[PDB]
């Protein structure tokens, strides 16, 4: 009774419900996972189709914050765009006062501090966004971090977000993160995404992909679907 | 029922009712249907008034030369954001000596409405803006919501019972990209004509249309300026 | 607003209504009074008329006590049922 | 006995008690960890562990041993989101000590300054008390090694051997008998006891890869994290 | 700073602390006053003095300048501030535009400042009102009144405090052209207005008249006792 | 369920604004008329007792030289807007050497329509009737406490405004002369007032491009009284 | 100059068991006399004084600020102010403005509130604390002050010889410069009583 | 500015009593016992610090934190709120020592500190301290002993006590401690009355004895602490 | 965050000030102080709250504070609560003496503090001051003056006083003992001791439980007489001799 109101207020169970409600808030969003190969980092986003709804390529959850880093977000899109501006401005501070590529670690840390700070005051609310962070470089290598609305900064070789999560990362153990090059990881991910997320709930959908690594020379960009057209080729034949 | 008090509080279901209650204000506004083709874009709005003697309140208003917009709901925050909207126009028009592509322009709007959707004591903004504009790749149509989500579309509609208009859209909006400005206009208002009751107009003064193009600057059409657009149309059947 | 007078039409059968009394004028002076308070309006008309021995209540006679009977009873409490559930 | 908003804010109960800090006390149990702090004559050992639910976990990113100073490490308990926020402020205050006073911080005063800020979190009712638990070590000139702890009551603490948290109540009473008697403490003595107190509480006896063992000794005073290879040497040394 | 909404609009359209503030004025001291062509007169009562305490400390009537005099009702604590406020504004109207101060200008300052004093955050409305009396330039009379909402308004006669309806009822026989056709009669007219006011014991009643530009003189309970004597003598000759 | 006084309704909209519209019902009624010759506007002073001084309360004050205005509900509530708007139009005249249009006053007040809040306090519930003569001739405008502007030919406010618009549109037409509109106002006024008609009960606010200002003067209304 | 504008000389000297302080009564702008009744030394507390030399504005201002904090000190703590605490109070007050300092030559001559023990000190215009065990001299011309007092003042002096000594010193020093004169006032204080005398000096 | 709410959380009860401050008095009673004695030459304070487990070392944390070289102090109640006003008073005496260049009077510390503390009770949105200070020192040859409270009032006692059973101890200090005795006796009856409510174990680490000589405050080492009381009292 | 404030500032719908009513109830308890009309002097007395003989009594005047050389005050309420106000008004007085170099008269002094107290009442939700303290002093114009401070922001200055609610019987006693222009301050002193000899619950009238601070007008020193209990005891026994003589009638 009223304990869940302010995030700064504790509960008789010794936690904060505002974080808790914020977590499943991101779970109701469409599935968005991530995985990293050895020479790069793969991103993926699944865009639902309700009515039409509008033009293809709109309000994609794949955002590019930095030269070598990008944002694959889930949950409420607005807060994700605002936090993408926050990471943009922080990265700009690093490039201003140092002049080289911001390491993934301290990047996601600087963001994580904000995620935690907006949960220590009754004025603002915990964020309803959970996003994937990954990058590759020659003096750095392949790192992937997972950030949650509570403000925990950590990372795995792969992670899953959205309504399909446990079932989305179940087949990840079958995939080889090391031996499999990124070129193959693309199709390996897209085929399961086409098989997961059953079409009874959502009749139509659309899938976005992004990648950064050595093949793009550290430049992070959405992989062009007219190029190689990898997904539908193998994903439409992978249903059997 | 007490957890809907603040904008900061997260519902046990994770749905903040303040934004939904603003969406109801969007539904209480007039039905306006915007649409664009591969070349020119046409936006249509509906004028309403309280008494017969009162002049119908206009919706579409001119901001940038190539950027017109519609409106619905609260006019207070609407004109506030409209001052902001003018600011952003003349800004790049001064510094860069060039206008701003709407794509990057509305991001600024969503970030503007992000703060009052989070900090305590602040309220969201009820908004019915439908923005149209031409960068080098042609027209763009977006949508505005108190949640601060803008969606790129070829056509969208808000207001009272504006979904029924969409039902006419889906089949028509795919084939309306090739057509020129002329028929595009009346195809715009054909969606509104099914939103209003079918036993009455749909006059010239209760409706607002504007046309904007890559080579055609945006001009507000109202009253007698709508007379060329309404003429030569077929009435709705029974 | 236009419906407030209907309560006055039902209560008009009681006592005696002078032909010059306007109900629509009195009705606007008491918004949000439902029917109970205006029942007490018609009531205090003849109530204060008995004390003044008047057989019929003249429109100007009771209204002087009607602005008082709405305000004086709103002074301690305005009866905010809208606030009870809000 | 409770009256008014005292459950939701930070004040005194009708009996003088505070509800928020007692909730934060059990806030550590939601992390499900254990930390044991043992100090010898010339040495001090810190032992902890980690949970690896998925094979995608990186040992490096999820390591719970934080290093504030080259010569002074630390560890935390409970949720990590709250601990991280305290990490950067620990380090910041270390650097400002080094800037203002020109010499390394005793670490004795570090927990005190930190605990003052923790008082502010305890005082203001419109901000979260930050219930993470701070555990530090240190090295003083001719004072031997030192072991400190800090709890979110806004106070400082530091003893010979102290262990606080979920299961630490039982590890304490186990340590009290091992310290004395008359038993002296050397390097291998402390290292070999770190696992005994963990086994008595747990008795899982698992792969050394999950547990992390920190140590601080005056040979090279620089703090050092132990490799799994040598940890396994001590683990087979204690089991004959 | 201090940000809080003190007064809000209720769904009935009436504010709360504003209209409720009028009850404090009904529960305050009673004060009266009149206007005339030459000598304007005020009044005050319900002092509740124990006759063992000095009257200047309980004094309810002050003046900004010799031309414009101040009279308030209700609780004095909130009036102190309004006084000093109006003193600064009267001294500014003196500073710039050196002409004497007009009641219409100064009371409008009190009302405006009290209005925003009911609007901004961290501001609790006053529960008191007041009425100002003087004599306009060129021998004209001047008076105005204040309101919790800050609505200035000029009366022909002052009826406020406990039993304002009762005194105002007596003013109906006061507005006759005969009263007051003479200053000598105006004074006794205040005593006759206070006779139906409060206890009308002839002790707490205090009044000062201002004739044209001449400053007012507070009268001791010497002439007021003779005026009471002639009041009971007028009721004697009326039988 | 009193939420920050700035928070939307479940239906919904702004609570305090919705409630502030009801305060117009308890205020005095005023009926303006727009004519091709001019703009005439009248109000009922609603005199409670003979203690009231006739010229003390004036519901109509002219904001700009050629632009008038009429308030609604509470008086001092509009005071703050009144005196500040006149300054607005004045400064317009200073920068551009030209007077402000009747339409300009609208957005002038709309920008300050709702400034209330806590950080960074109560919205005024006084409605405004804007009279004046712009470059297009005599114009009459109406605005509401929520800030929604609408151009009204003949608009009424206060209590009976619902009943007043009623008999209004019945007798209203676009061929109304100014002298006809004048005596058409008082017909409705005398039906909605309890006190007998006198020069102290109501006042007429008229303005014309060729007759000004005007404003209005005394004894002119006294001739209109006998015109009934 | 700045200090030669108004001028003035303040001289304080300690006797055997007592202490004396004296200052000239001339007040004028440059070479123009104004008034001779102007008061420079002001009484502070009991059995204690303060001398001031410089612009008369800073004299009065510093005197009033000093009385300000003084009373606040003696109202909180019933004990009288100590001589060391007084000198430190003045030092702080003058140091408050580093780049906007007042132009004055403070001279502090007063008895210890504890015992008959006297004390003397003078501070720099920027508030530099300075103490002496013989005398303190601040004014227009320091040559005749330091010149005469070393050949006159003795370690042990009764009030008779103290008065006459500081007398002829102020006479010979003041009569040399034209920006001082118009009589000199002498304040000699002891444990038993306070004595104030006015010297006979040239009025030209 | 936080947001700057700053609304006082302590209302006045119908009887005039304070809510949060009386509850803080409950926190003072629930604290630890600490006695003090003002007799003859100087003031002697006796605190009590007991470890909840045998793993604890009291050579690190000190309960007696002298603010000045000639001004010591102890406390009762919760420690966290004690450290706060410690650092406070440390910065607070320095303006006095900087302006006047003179050791600040014990009675001056109280007024300044309790004024900021009382404001800390009236300041909106924050709870008062739950610590009752016992302030001592020697100034002008006559030492002094003061006692503070969460509401901020200040008293002067020859021998006082705080903590549990302080009302029972107070009657002991009244009869058993009177007139004026040397610092040695001051230590004696202090330790006797502290051993009243203390456990059946008394070690150098169980308590500490602070002393204010007219030569200035000196904090005694646990060595002498166990030397006088061994053989307690 | 709006729900956490108790709304101490806003009124009570009954017409009363909610916080201020409870505020006055604090003055009803605790402190007790008196005042009386005296010629060529003024007198004040208070009842010590801690009558325990273990105190050091090194504070000299406790419940009687001296804000100025010509004026003093008698506090009733929480000590430190006043101690903010005493240094406050003390600085205001001292800045009058700084600006004009003239002793501040009692009028504007008191009213300045009263407006300070009023400020805390109309905004901020702050804790008002529940300390009602008295005022004495002498000015050139009006001479000896008696005033009293109220939490409500009004100054309660009269020629007599009731502090606290226990003294409301002293007011009824003062209406029977009312006098004009009679001093003999010792008569008013035996009167004020006659007040606590009856109205006060503590009997025997212990000279160590009360403190009498008189201020006699002296030019220009304005002598402030702080008396010791030794000469008060013989005065008390002189009063008890007057009591023993009054029972000799019947
Ligand atoms: N609009 C109306 N029409 C007719 N009668 C009315 C109206 N409003 C009120 N009344 C009369 O007023 C009387 C008092 O109403 P009453 O107090 O019974 O409502 P209620 O039962 O208390 O409402 P609720 O059950 O919601 O509390 C009723 O007997 C009813 O006849």
Short mmCIF file of C-alpha atoms in Angstrom, two decimals, chain A residues 4-5 18 21-22 24-25 51-55 58-59 76-79 81-82 85 118 122-128, chain B residues 2-3 7-14 16 111 114 117-120 147-154 156 170 173 177:
data_model
loop_
_atom_site.label_atom_id
_atom_site.label_comp_id
_atom_site.label_asym_id
_atom_site.label_seq_id
_atom_site.Cartn_x
_atom_site.Cartn_y
_atom_site.Cartn_z
CA UNK A 4 5.51 0.92 -4.75
CA UNK A 5 4.74 4.61 -5.43
CA UNK A 18 9.24 0.52 -9.67
CA UNK A 21 7.41 -3.06 -13.04
CA UNK A 22 9.93 -1.38 -15.33
CA UNK A 24 8.48 -6.56 -17.45
CA UNK A 25 7.59 -3.31 -19.21
CA UNK A 51 -2.38 -3.01 -39.23
CA UNK A 52 -0.09 -1.99 -42.06
CA UNK A 53 1.15 -0.01 -40.17
CA UNK A 54 3.15 2.50 -42.20
CA UNK A 55 6.26 2.78 -44.38
CA UNK A 58 10.40 3.64 -39.82
CA UNK A 59 11.34 4.09 -36.14
CA UNK A 76 9.43 2.12 -24.88
CA UNK A 77 10.95 3.75 -27.95
CA UNK A 78 10.93 7.36 -26.72
CA UNK A 79 13.09 6.78 -23.64
CA UNK A 81 15.86 7.67 -28.23
CA UNK A 82 16.53 10.07 -25.34
CA UNK A 85 21.13 11.15 -27.15
CA UNK A 118 17.24 8.11 -12.22
CA UNK A 122 11.17 10.41 -6.46
CA UNK A 123 11.10 13.11 -9.17
CA UNK A 124 12.07 10.96 -12.14
CA UNK A 125 11.24 7.32 -12.83
CA UNK A 126 13.25 4.18 -13.58
CA UNK A 127 13.85 3.79 -17.30
CA UNK A 128 11.74 1.34 -19.27
CA UNK B 2 -4.26 5.70 -6.23
CA UNK B 3 -1.25 4.68 -8.36
CA UNK B 7 3.37 10.55 -13.93
CA UNK B 8 6.46 9.01 -12.28
CA UNK B 9 4.70 5.98 -10.77
CA UNK B 10 4.83 2.73 -12.76
CA UNK B 11 1.59 0.78 -12.86
CA UNK B 12 1.72 -2.83 -11.64
CA UNK B 13 1.17 -3.63 -15.32
CA UNK B 14 3.82 -1.15 -16.44
CA UNK B 16 1.43 4.76 -17.13
CA UNK B 111 13.31 14.89 -26.61
CA UNK B 114 10.56 13.53 -22.81
CA UNK B 117 6.75 12.74 -19.21
CA UNK B 118 9.20 11.77 -16.47
CA UNK B 119 9.93 14.47 -13.89
CA UNK B 120 7.47 14.85 -11.01
CA UNK B 147 4.17 9.26 -25.50
CA UNK B 148 6.63 11.07 -27.83
CA UNK B 149 6.76 8.36 -30.51
CA UNK B 150 6.96 9.56 -34.11
CA UNK B 151 6.32 7.03 -36.88
CA UNK B 152 7.30 7.55 -40.51
CA UNK B 153 4.31 6.76 -42.72
CA UNK B 154 2.82 7.50 -46.10
CA UNK B 156 -1.90 8.47 -40.91
CA UNK B 170 -5.08 0.36 -46.70
CA UNK B 173 -2.92 4.30 -50.06
CA UNK B 177 1.39 7.05 -54.78
#
